[PDB]
Symmetry: C4
Subunit: 469 residues, 4 copies
């Protein structure tokens, strides 16, 4: 048993072609896959961008239409500070709603009965929520509260082509005021993509938030969007359904070939392993079995499955049976990234072109072992900064934001702005400012000078082991 | 005397378990400590955030209520430039104060007699301060000044449900005008945390600062906050007092075990040292005694003490006997960081996982010796930039800010903005701008290219000494 | 055949001078070329800057003159949100146009018949474009559209020293409104450069873009500029035409000398190659022939040709036969860069001064081979981020912008701002935000820690091979 | 001749003390010098800051008093766009000037005859400048210009407690309009520093710049400041004159000791050199003579001279014989930096503390040789970017600013903003944008990946040569 088949298996495509009449089908498939998958992603992106733009621009238009005195960029400071201001804002929202068709540049339709759960069939609900009992008397340092939340609702209806004016807010025990209503509009711009326009229903919520009871009432407008096909569409003028099929067939072929290669590898591993058990004791091999498994074909199969799922979802969206543009975009984009990466398989046969992969495979164990110890320090800093500085520092507001701030600091990014945020307000206490000084200096100097230096040293050390000289 | 006990002492928890019936209690304790201390920090953070938000939002509301024409973001340029503007601002502040209940969204109560030290029982004090004698006559390049500061006060009282209008400011010798008053409000939002609301007393100071006599009078509003429990609270609806006890008991157990280990180490060191003095001359060992001391147990004991102190302070705050949220937050956060870090003790038994610690211990002496020489250069630059460029450069205003700017520059951060601040005004003199050019180029090129390179070289050199190959 | 000529050829200028009576003409030429080409670039820059400034300042003035309520910096958010606002903006533009001479600080002349292609001889065209048939009825989730674009035009003429007021916009099917007109003005500031002023014709287009049909209509103003000489110029007061000739002659001399050197090298290579074919088998040498070619002379010849072309174009522009300032500026600037770089030729004879060039020549093959594998990963990330995040992330809007963002991220620049753009809106979906987290963390950690580290290792490895020790 | 004196000379202070009764006077002097010079710098900084703040705040106040509609931050876009706007701005400036005492918060005095050179004894000059002959007729693409500048002046005088209203601007040939006047005020805040207030004369120039003739007229206000002592000052209440003498004496002592050491070194070098010429041929030594010269004493002497000059200038300023605060601040700050640095002399005797200095001395020759080649590339890029992109890119406006931009780019700073400035306007031509892409990508990749990597490699290589292992 000379066993030249083992050597044949771990051969490059050129070597396999020189050996047998083996034309490389997987490689040319992968090139075609890169081209077609990238083109499909871009084609989908046209429609996806149209949808996102429609949503965002309608929301901005609503903010200008319904928020008294609103200007772009003021969103996070937009607030009322007097009873008169609050009343004027609420009444302005309702009044603008009642005359929308006469003023708006967009073609909106009212949605009868879309006033929210506290609506009783009316199209707009004007709700104020307050404590069941509130007896706030700071003058005597006394209060009597029943924290039960009471909802008082006023129903408003559009004229088919007043009551809300008599609103009396219980300011001292007010929790919030909300305005709920729905508007319907058609995304006509989809015609530029030879698609039939969909019906969009925007659910608009305006909140006057007094939950802090701090004398300042933040005002915000949020929208939910529901996309569905029009009941009676008609376009007079009215290819990629076949391009999606082409992508699907290419990815199916790649999947089949890669699965055949994986089964071949499994069989070869099993035959070699039993022959070895015959050559010496039985059960010699524990991990070389895994070495027989090449992860590039696994990656390719995963990418094929993701691409097929994305293509099917895209076909459903075009067919109007689905409106999940974000999920489809994520599937297609991840697939595109993986398809581009997978071609690296054929560069690993040439050591001069495989520096990155070889280095990574030799460095990963030590890197992971080092990161075990770095993780505890990093998480301790994350939690400490999140709780201690979160109230005072804009960049420490949430756990994910604290992580972003610390990760950027490790990379030397946004350092002075991080210090200056504390200089600006000192945390309104010299002790908090001093703590921020210690926290930031220590974290930056540790992670930049020791952790990152040693991490890089491990990477370059691995490279030094694998480089030919 | 075979002395296997010495070897037993410097053994890993797994080795100690294999040797005797020694179950690792300190390690599992540390894991439990990490969990419970982190959870306690987050739980405290809920309340701490509520308090901070109340303070900040009330201050912003005051700025909008009392500062004529105030808009968010203008705080550092907000100023008056004419006598009419100054008078209008002062009168607007007082007028808004007198009608606060009718306009404010928050429920504020006046504080009778809270008008400050220059108040004589009135709730608002309107004070102007000027030189005792001022005869400023620029026309003749003459002046006659008695720098004694005279305070002239006007008392204002709220209506229990005018005089200040006749204010005549001595502009040519005016130092500043201040408005002092106090407002009381209840932080009702604490109910969301199942806590009883506290009474907050805000001390409000508005300053029209003419100390520069420059024709521009900066206007600012500052608040002090005093938190105390309400006299007669009553909430109808109304666990972590036991979680704090759990944390305290866990940290006490860890403290006891670590102290026992430290005493054991001391005894072992003393016995080994006398046996060595018997084996050879007396008083051989000078520093290995210190090697017998393991600093991880010292760190753990310190963390336990800090955690207990923070927990006790938190219990006091909940009990309403204390309102020091910043001190408690700092104690708890530092404790959390130290508790997370301390688990690294058990990674030091495995050289593959101890790269950071081992490198640091070998590199620290050379790093400190190098930093001795770098410190003099750094401090010279700090003082030079603080005095020479502080007047002209926003980022060189104070010593701490100069240090932040230089430290960020060392890390390659905010470079062009630092240059552009000087380009914008040139320091209003070509000589100062040229000096800034030399200062910045020299500091950046020295510290980035030589100091940091050599510092990193020392770190990686230490790592090269300690890495197995 | 001793063949000392080969050794003579690969000799330094000092060695050649010591050998024969060879004075270095190319080196002194290159120094003179650097001086004269740099001076010529700066001299041209005077005029170029004047032209650019005229264009930009006129455009800003038009934006202030014709865009109702326009303020600097609002350009990308400037939009209308109500029918009244749109009508007011359009009418304001036309009204300001009709009274331009009475109000504008610049001296503009109307251009009769410059109203655009849809003008029928009038100086201003006010066009609205809408669908041929539009029956948008969101109320019933129905529409009937003929996507044919209909253009309806109103002609306006200036008074030689109304109809447009009756404009009725078809809002529900409106695509856009445009205002086209032309203005003529003289760039008098060119007199400061002793040049005769040119006639500028600005083509002004104002667009009210409703292509999104989103209830928000962006308003923008764009200008095309046409530069031509005045028919009857007359300046009473009225050197570098000779400086351009000097530059041309210097570059011609350099070109001739370098071409002679290249021909000499070719002849020497051909003689050596045939002598070698005589010494051993025929056709021994395959690539040393190319080694006989020195690329510095090729670079110099290219720079000479570019400098001559730029100088000729500059002479044409001065003569008023050409107005292509950007092309000329690019030719002259590239030439200047190349002329400065080319002097490095004479530093390559001294190994202590040739570190950069020698390192680069040894490192380039491995660097290119490594970049082959890095390119696929980089392009996969580029496409994925462009499509998936382009709609949600300001820095991922276009392919070139995505490339700029990723390239800057590789260099550790603008990291936290990139994360915060996603924090601000979350992509309006938690799934998109999570994907952005994974995308950014993975790309940054891969490219900063592995790719860049290995790239630098390759560079320093090459340097280690070429450094004398 | 055993010559132990040579070895004695190159000995550390501790070794010299152990050898003879040599107490280290220079070292303790240097410590005292650091303390006293730093304190003196800070003390001077108090006064310097007061002066700068007075100047800046008065200028801001003038901008608010005289610039119609001015708001903070608008300075670089502040401009007029219509004839009415221009007239209103000019008249507002003059009107506000005429009622300054009634409105301003500062105490300003008019300066009779301070209206500038074109004033004929009046306190305010209102000048318009225009071409001697201007016949701008864009309608016919004709012009007739006599570029001679004609100045037409209107004199305005303050009421001692109209004509300017009839100003007719020649818009079509207007070059600029200026308003010149002077105001006098006293810097009373200097009293807080126990100093007698000085008289400040502000020269105010307001420019309406039409030099571009672009339909947009930038408006700016600039001030010159002249400081002189008051004629008749009188302060009722009214140490560092002795602290300056203490600094002077300390620096004189250091100077004398260092000069004595330098003379000693010269004599020792001369004696050793002649003894060597006796031991072997004459004129053996060429450069070791220079090795006998220690540059730290030269640095110290330079620092002493600078400190003495700064102290004398500071004494003159306090005495009111001088007002050059910037020159004095620069002298004192540079002196402080040098005094701090000079203490490094005593760390060079201990190799563990001398890593930086030793590395630098071994690396400097190779670093300078490498920088020779890098300089040509850097300068070529600087000039190319300055001319080609200066008109289009905010960060390439001037040579110094281009250098700052490129230097920051080398350090990885402000990269995406540099790209985005070009994305925003594309240079208003796709060709310029493409060139910017090539320019930036090439410069960044070359300088970050090759130049900086090799520079650092040279530094660390030198360190590797000098490190003990
Ligand atoms: C269930 C899957 C059936 C696969 C049938 C393939 C039959 C066939 O012709 O093989 C050559 C190529 C595909 O073959 P392909 O996958 O490209 O090539 C194989 C790989 O090179 C493999 O090595 P690795 O790359 O390292 O895993 C090697 O061991 C195999 O040798 P071996 O076969 O001697 O053991 C090759 O055949 O065929 C086409 O070009 C597609 C024709 C389109 C119709 C495909 C119908 C599915
Ligand atoms: C005053 C303190 C009294 C400590 C009493 C402990 C008695 C006991 O059972 O030991 C085993 C563990 C704690 O024991 P623990 O501290 O976890 O374990 C010790 C450490 O491993 C130590 O090495 P280092 O880690 O390197 O310092 C080793 O030398 C000791 O061996 P040795 O004793 O043979 O000399 C171990 O006993 O006990 C519990 O699991 C807690 C039971 C809860 C009740 C604790 C009451 C305080
Ligand atoms: C014209 C200058 C006259 C200098 C007179 C100094 C006479 C005196 O006492 O020397 C010891 C110290 C100063 O002496 P000082 O400069 O601190 O010390 C000298 C340095 O250590 C020098 O080495 P380097 O540091 O490497 O250059 C060394 O060669 C000299 O040895 P040598 O003399 O045997 O050749 C030392 O005397 O004296 C005071 O402590 C100041 C007393 C205040 C009054 C000073 C009056 C000026
Ligand atoms: C207003 O325009 C005039 C005319 O261009 C400028 O006058 C020049 O001023 C400079 C500096 O004061 C002199 O060196 C020149 O000789 C003057 N004449 C010319 C023809 O340049 C004047 O500088 C401008 N004023 C401002 C404030 O920009
Ligand atoms: Na950086
Ligand atoms: Na940065």
């Amino acid at each position: 048993d000379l066993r030249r088949r083992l050597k044949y298996f771990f051969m490059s495509p050129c070597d396999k072609f020189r050996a047998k009449g083996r034309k490389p089908c997987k490689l040319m498939l992968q090139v075609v896959k890169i081209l077609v998958v990238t083109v499909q992603l871009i084609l989908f992106g046209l429609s996806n961008q149209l949808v996102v733009t429609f949503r965002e621009e309608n929301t901005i238009a609503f903010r200008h239409l319904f928020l008294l005195g609103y200007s772009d960029g003021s969103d996070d400071t937009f607030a009322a500070y007097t009873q008169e201001q609050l009343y004027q804002a609420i009444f302005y929202a309702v009044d603008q709603y009642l005359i929308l068709p006469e003023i708006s540049l967009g073609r909106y339709a009212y949605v009868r009965g879309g006033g929210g759960p506290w609506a009783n069939g009316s199209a707009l609900a004007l709700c104020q929520r307050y404590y069941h009992r509130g007896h706030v008397d700071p003058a005597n340092d006394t209060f009597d509260i029943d924290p039960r939340v009471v909802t008082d609702c006023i129903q408003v209806d559009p004229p088919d082509r007043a009551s809300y004016k008599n609103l009396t807010l219980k300011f001292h025990k007010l929790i919030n005021v909300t305005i709920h209503f729905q508007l319907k509009t058609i995304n006509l711009q989809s015609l530029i993509n030879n698609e039939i326009p969909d019906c969009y229903t925007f659910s608009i919520l305006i909140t006057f938030d007094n939950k802090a009871h701090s004398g300042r009432i933040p005002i915000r407008l949020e929208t939910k969007t529901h996309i569905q096909e029009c009941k009676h569409p008609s376009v007079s003028r009215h290819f990629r359904l076949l391009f999606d099929v082409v992508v699907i067939l290419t990815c199916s072929l790649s999947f089949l070939l890669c699965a055949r290669s994986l089964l071949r590898g499994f069989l070869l591993q099993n035959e070699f392993v039993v022959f070895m058990w015959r050559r010496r004791g039985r059960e010699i091999s524990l991990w070389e079995r895994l070495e027989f498994v090449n992860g590039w074909y696994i990656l390719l199969v995963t990418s094929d499955v993701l691409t097929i799922s994305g293509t099917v979802m895209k076909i459903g969206i075009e067919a109007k049976n689905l409106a999940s543009y974000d999920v489809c975009s994520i599937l297609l984009g991840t697939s595109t990234l993986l398809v581009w990466v997978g071609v690296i398989r054929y560069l690993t046969f040439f050591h001069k072109y495989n520096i990155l992969i070889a280095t990574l495979r030799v460095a990963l164990p030590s890197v992971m072992r080092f990161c075990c110890c770095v993780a505890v320090i990093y998480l301790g800093y994350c939690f400490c900064g999140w709780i201690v500085l979160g109230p005072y520092h804009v960049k420490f507001r949430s756990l994910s934001m604290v992580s972003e701030c610390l990760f950027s600091l490790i990379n030397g990014d946004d350092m002075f702005v991080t210090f200056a945020a504390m200089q600006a307000q000192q945390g309104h206490s010299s002790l908090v400012w001093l703590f921020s000084q210690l926290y930031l200096y220590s974290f930056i100097s540790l992670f930049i000078y020791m952790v990152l230096s040693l991490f890089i040293a491990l990477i370059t050390g691995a490279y030094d082991t694998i480089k030919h000289p």
